[PDB]
Specification:
Chain A: It catalyses: (5Z,8Z,11Z,14Z)-eicosatetraenoate + AH2 + 2 O2 = prostaglandin H2 + A + H2O; (5Z,8Z,11Z,14Z)-eicosatetraenoate + 2 O2 = prostaglandin G2; prostaglandin G2 + AH2 = prostaglandin H2 + A + H2O; (5Z,8Z,11Z,14Z,17Z)-eicosapentaenoate + 2 O2 = prostaglandin G3. 2 copies of one chain form a homodimer. Chain A is mainly α. The first copy, chain A, is 43% helix and 5% strand. The structure holds protoporphyrin IX containing CO (COH) (2 copies), a molecule of 3 linked components (NAG-NAG-MAN), a molecule of 2 linked components (NAG-NAG) (3 copies), arachidonic acid (2 copies), octyl beta-D-glucopyranoside (BOG) (2 copies) and 2-acetamido-2-deoxy-beta-D-glucopyranose (NAG) (2 copies).
Chain lengths: 551, 552
């Protein structure tokens, strides 16, 4: 079998076979040397002794509110701190991208083929004696057993950080522009060839699909008006393929950028909000530029909406998730003096970690109604009956479920949760602790240390036997959360690098794009730099209801 | 008409319409302010006072040969100079890329659509009152008149720098991996979706083509043996589509990565050399890794060959071309402490400036024979008859034409030269002087200053009237060359930025790829760092004939 099965190279060393049963480690630029890149250089010794742990930093960022208030109101310090956040996080990501499901060594095929998700760690070789390499049993524990013992919800565990349904559907809507798995090809393949925040979930992945969705007047998107209210246009009207059960009434077959968005009325809420926003921006730009044509109005609006999305994601969405007293900032200018690659490739593991199915409530509570999953799935009727105002008001009030801490996956989505385990096994994922080491974390030494608890830990110990073969996805959902937090350490420490890299790595953040002229002048530039989730809803929802990502 | 037609914004300022009759210039990070970004900031004033002109820097690099001999032997100093050559040139390129033929403003379509060539300068708007904007006549001069008066070869003018036929065909072979115009769509569109040095002209653009060219044993490419010599396989054997006229027999239909390489035996020469190199590297890698399979051997060989190619392009090809006494260096590590984007998008203007048709000779001289264009085109029998050794020996000593200086396009490719002018106009290119300002060069004030001469200058003046409506491509071919040199100023100052961006921007040059293990260990890595045109030929051509890019 492959000599690198045991994962012998440490500290980001590269393993290469040199014979049938011999390997070598390439310690180039790791700060380490020796056979396995474990002997630190003198400079690395001092860097290690002085580096605070992720949990220490977390404690500082979530405490001393009085100091942060001062720091937040001095732009020089705010910028300084945000600059460090962006750079230190992004440095953990290979960019240009490296491995994928089929390639555990660098290759031109792996670099150039955009159909693959990329990989932060190379897959376990096909001939390895063990699923995780050399450690553990000949098979991983049964998929269903792990799910039932440790993942499935008994009683609803609300998020202590206060995340609501506005946050939960935003997460789903937003991420489904870059997590679009090509199930025809396999779990390691993507249909999102733009690999980032391109807004294909609004505009369509292809030019053919985009042009069917456009009005070709004033830069706007097609729409229908039901009950005086503006909604996405119809499948029949546009000839835009969508996924719908055969029984859905013609006029509730809404056509939007992303094919799967008719599945959940919560996604159509955001789909409707964003379509209105685009046409609102068209109106603004037509005012500033009576001379512009349909095409330029459309493209400029799209760039503006990308900017708005990135702004909201950092300053409202990640801000909420973090729990920090420090106010995160969206400012491309922070990187203009830094080394940074304005490109992104979506990683399979980033897809895997974002399976936040525990966020889902037991029922979806609109106005006086409480809908079960069966009633809510594929029911755009609910959206038309209640309206966007009521949707926002209700979902702002409804608490979401806790992700870490264990046992909070709703049984309605049990098949999806199991699929996450099975597919990551098909894609030969390395172990939790291998991923922790990859992102500068200390490997867990026991199951009890993972869960901060005894019962689930005991169950897991019987199932996996060795902590060093525990699986990434299940561990993320059972991990001891931070104090009164939605996530545990591994979720934050892996997720933040991928996230900031996808956000800042956008062409619009690059110096030749980050100018008012790109967005139609100061007016369009202002729309981006003052965007918020509140103003998104205020501008596009009748009655301007209060909203936020917390209850 | 569009308010920005007159290109009012200077120094990289971006023009935006603010009404039917009005514009605004965005001067962000240009170092200038004011209505048209022409009022310099204080720091900018100092920088402009102490900045040498491209001409004086060229002088320094082409003189003081003894000084440069010392400099070339001081690793620290060589690194410092080479580092500045890379950075100062690269900042002239937009990366991520901006405009294209359909988009004079920034847009997601322009950014994300790999089928377009990008544009260093936005096209002239569709409703502008003149082709160049506001200046000059309603119509440009007849391109046939321009071609005939100042472009067409009278007597052959040899290159003073001594470029040979090895250099001319290497240029053609190398660049045709990334200049692959999509004629079914138009001249602003490409088929090279990799936009750089991916070696698709060897391995194929798509995975289907690659798999048909591969042997699936030992990482190797399919081949055939003719008279004990290794050549590419046939169309019949691979089912690989190639462009060949009907009269070409089955056995002479060689199949290579790039569809058009059957056109020219000089191209098929390099195709055969590089196929041999691939299979040679596979042999070496199998010796180091008897445990590896076919797929890893193929892929790792591809990565090494990409390395070899960049190494050769910088240290042999650009070196010869530059005329410098300073030794250029391929070293990715020079950029590791620098702000640099490891990505590339091929620019339409880079394609246009690379139409070096004056390089071509009147006849192709192999051993005893002198083949006309008609006898040479599509005639791979010439290659089998003489062999690679005689091809290398013959092309090494045959001189190429001078590109700049006028009247040196061979009449055989008359139609191709005219097409370069026509297509430029079709793609709504801005004027020569606009492109010069775009690259920090002084605009020419007269046709005489452009040509350094009187006869062609006056003909051009009668055709164009105004120096500010002179077109880019004709100007490059008529421009006053540097002393005893192949190119004029505009060719080098536009060409170099596009070039180093394409070479260093390649993912293998990035810190995570530039490691011995990417290339299968220290042996594989050393193949890259010791690669040269001579060694490529020595290892792959029987007898190891001597070669270089100059006649000597
Ligand atoms: C954080 C947002 C979020 C939530 C709340 C969520 C909870 C829900 C939910 C309840 C309303 C429904 C009806 C769905 C339905 C689906 N989810 Co999500 N999943 C979410 C983010 C994801 C991710 C991540 C994937 C995997 C990527 C993929 O398959 O495209 C996913 C995939 C899907 C798929 C494709 C099948 C597969 O193989 O994964 C279906 C169907 N969906 N999930
Ligand atoms: C620098 C290398 C080089 C040389 C020596 C060269 C000299 C020669 C030559 C002598 C052997 C032959 C037979 C050809 C034949 C052709 N050249 Co070149 N051209 C070259 C680089 C180009 C470029 C640049 C173009 C523009 C279009 C493209 O490459 O897609 C070109 C285009 C072509 C085309 C049609 C494509 C188009 O213009 O759209 C033909 C036919 N060829 N040319
Ligand atoms: C990058 O831009 C290319 C040029 O715009 C584009 O190719 C174009 O695609 C359009 C729309 O798909 C094609 O137009 C089609 O229109 C109707 C659809 O009903 C059909 O009847 C026609 O057969 C036709 O295919 C054009 O053919 C084509 N335009 C060209 C070649 O100039 C690419 O699609 C873009 N690339 C991506 C990835 O989006
Ligand atoms: C910056 O813009 C240019 C536009 O090219 C210039 O406008 C020109 O000024 C001429 C007089 O110097 C006028 O005849 C005419 O209005 C205009 N020319 C053309 C061809 O449109 C502005 O003067 C200049 N502004 C500044 C402040 O320098
Ligand atoms: C580098 O790593 C290898 C493998 O991880 C180490 O070799 C193993 O060490 C353990 C000691 O706990 C033994 O049980 C194994 O049998 C050893 N051999 C193999 C082939 O796995 C090696 O010691 C490390 N080298 C250094 C210098 O630290
Ligand atoms: C990217 O990779 C995929 C998978 O390797 C390629 O799809 C394969 O293409 C071959 C030959 O074209 C088919 O025989 C296989 O069935 C495909 N594999 C699948 C569908 O999983 C794909 O062609 C590559 N993309 C590009 C642009 O080269
Ligand atoms: C591909 C484009 C990327 C878009 C970004 C998508 C999602 C961002 C949100 C969550 C990512 C997952 C975990 C990060 C959790 C908290 C962030 C705060 C940590 C920090 O700030 O230190
Ligand atoms: C994808 C791009 C690949 C690179 C293109 C390959 C070769 C470029 C060769 C010539 C380009 C035009 C003019 C001359 C360029 C450099 C000469 C020395 C100038 C310098 O060094 O200061
Ligand atoms: C409500 C749906 C959840 C079904 C899970 C039951 C199957 C897994 O068995 C679990 O064993 C655990 C031992 O620690 C018990 O604490 C759980 O109650 C039990 O569910
Ligand atoms: C041999 C010296 C070249 C003279 C320069 C050409 C001047 C115009 O010669 C033109 O070029 C072509 C050449 O066959 C012909 O097709 C045109 O009919 C002819 O007008
Ligand atoms: C559809 O949703 C509506 C709410 O308007 C509800 O009355 C109905 O029962 C739902 N239908 C199904 C099949 O769930
Ligand atoms: C092709 O070249 C061969 C030499 O190998 C020569 O004999 C023949 O005449 C040429 N064919 C044509 C059509 O010019």
């Amino acid at each position: 079998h492959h000599p690198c099965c045991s994962n012998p190279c440490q500290n980001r060393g590269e393993c290469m076979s040199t014979g049938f049963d011999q390997y070598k480690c390439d310690c180039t630029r790791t700060g380490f040397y020796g056979e396995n890149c474990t002997t630190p250089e003198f400079l690395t010794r001092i860097k290690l002794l002085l580096k605070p742990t992720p949990n220490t930093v977390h404690y500082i960022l979530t405490h001393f509110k009085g100091v942060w208030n001062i720091v937040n109101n001095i732009p020089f310090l705010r910028s300084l701190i945000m600059k460090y956040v962006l750079t230190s996080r992004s440095y953990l990501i290979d960019s240009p991208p490296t491995y994928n499901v089929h390639y555990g060594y660098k290759s031109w095929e792996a670099f150039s083929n955009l159909s693959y998700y990329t990989r932060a760690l190379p897959p376990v070789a096909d001939d390895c004696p063990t699923p995780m390499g050399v450690k553990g049993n000949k098979e991983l524990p049964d998929s269903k057993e792990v799910l039932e013992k440790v993942l499935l919800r008994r009683e609803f565990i609300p998020d202590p950080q206060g995340s609501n349904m506005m946050f939960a559907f935003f997460a789903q809507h937003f991420t489904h522009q870059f997590f679009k798995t090509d199930h025809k090809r396999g779990p390691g393949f993507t249909r999102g060839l733009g690999h980032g925040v391109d807004l294909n979930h609004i505009y369509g992945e292809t030019l053919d699909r985009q042009h069917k969705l456009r009005l070709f007047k004033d830069g706007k998107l097609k729409y229908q008006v039901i009950g005086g209210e503006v909604y996405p246009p119809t499948v029949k009207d546009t000839q835009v393929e969508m996924i719908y059960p055969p029984h859905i009434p013609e006029n509730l077959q809404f056509a939007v950028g992303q094919e799967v968005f008719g599945l959940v009325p919560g996604l159509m809420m955001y789909a409707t909000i964003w379509l209105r926003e685009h046409n609102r921006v068209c109106d603004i730009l037509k005012q500033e530029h009576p001379e512009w044509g349909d095409e330029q109005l459309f493209q400029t609006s799209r760039l503006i909406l990308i900017g708005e999305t990135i702004k909201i994601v950092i300053e409202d969405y990640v801000q909420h998730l973090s729990g920090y007293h420090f106010k995160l900032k969206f400012d491309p200018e922070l990187l203009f003096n830094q080394q940074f690659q304005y490109q992104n490739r979506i990683a399979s593991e980033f897809n895997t970690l974002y399976h936040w199915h525990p966020l889902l409530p037991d029922t979806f509570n609109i106005e006086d109604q409480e809908y079960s999953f069966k009633q809510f799935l594929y029911n755009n009727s609910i959206l038309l009956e209640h309206g966007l105002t009521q949707f926002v008001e209700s979902f702002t009030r409804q608490i979401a479920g806790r992700v870490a801490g264990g046992r909070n996956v709703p049984i309605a989505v049990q098949a999806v949760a199991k699929a996450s385990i099975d597919q990551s096994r098909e894609m030969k994922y390395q172990s939790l602790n291998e991923y922790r080491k990859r992102f500068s974390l200390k490997p867990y030494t026991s199951f009890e240390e993972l869960t901060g608890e005894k019962e689930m830990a005991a169950e897991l110990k019987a199932l996996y036997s060795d902590i060093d073969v525990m699986e990434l996805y299940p561990a993320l959902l059972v991990e001891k959360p931070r104090p009164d937090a939605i996530f545990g350490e591994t979720m934050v420490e892996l997720g933040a690098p991928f996230s900031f890299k996808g956000l800042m790595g956008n062409p619009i953040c690059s110096p030749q794009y980050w100018k008012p002229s790109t967005f139609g002048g100061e007016v369009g530039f202002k729309i981006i730099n003052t965007a918020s989730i509140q103003s998104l809803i205020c501008n596009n929802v009748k009655g301007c209801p209060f909203t936020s990502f917390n209850v």
